[PDB]
């Protein structure tokens, strides 16, 4: 989703998506707002959201539908308001890619740890080594 995108940008992103086999289930939206994204994540549930602080509400909405429908959010972008000193992070270059990879993998691992913390119910997957 990109609210302030244009048609040439949409064509470029579609071209970059077609070049990789992982962009088969990808759809690019321009001019859409966060309510459209709320509908999209409710009807076609992803694993995670990536965006600014304004997505925290969307996650909350999903949690109201159920824990199994919750879509956790990763705060990468502008603006971030509910987190401290994240504006010091890096995004460009090798260091930025390193930080982004670390954030994504650690978010996935925290979600997995949360999902398997129930004693005698789901703790069989509460692995020490991941």
């Amino acid at each position: 989703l990109c609210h302030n995108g244009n048609k040439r940008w949409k064509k470029a992103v579609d071209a970059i998506l077609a070049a990789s086999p992982y962009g088969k289930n990808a759809t690019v939206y321009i001019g859409k707002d966060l309510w459209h994204l709320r509908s999209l994540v409710f009807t076609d549930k992803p694993d995670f959201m990536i965006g600014n602080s304004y997505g925290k509400f969307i996650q909350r909405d999903t949690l109201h539908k159920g824990k199994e429908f919750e879509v956790p959010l990763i705060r990468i972008g502008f603006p971030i308001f509910d987190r401290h000193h994240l504006h010091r992070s890096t995004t460009l270059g090798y260091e930025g890619a390193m930080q982004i990879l670390t954030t994504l993998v650690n978010s996935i691992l925290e979600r997995l740890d949360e999902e398997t913390r129930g004693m005698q119910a789901t703790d069989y997957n509460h692995d020490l080594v991941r």
Binding site: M119, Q120, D123, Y124, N125, D127, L128, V129
Partner: peptide, 13 residues
């Protein structure tokens, strides 16, 4: 050797 092997089980540790 603590929890280094994934021998799954059911119970309250």
């Amino acid at each position: 050797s603590r929890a280094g092997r994934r021998n799954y089980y059911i119970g309250t540790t």
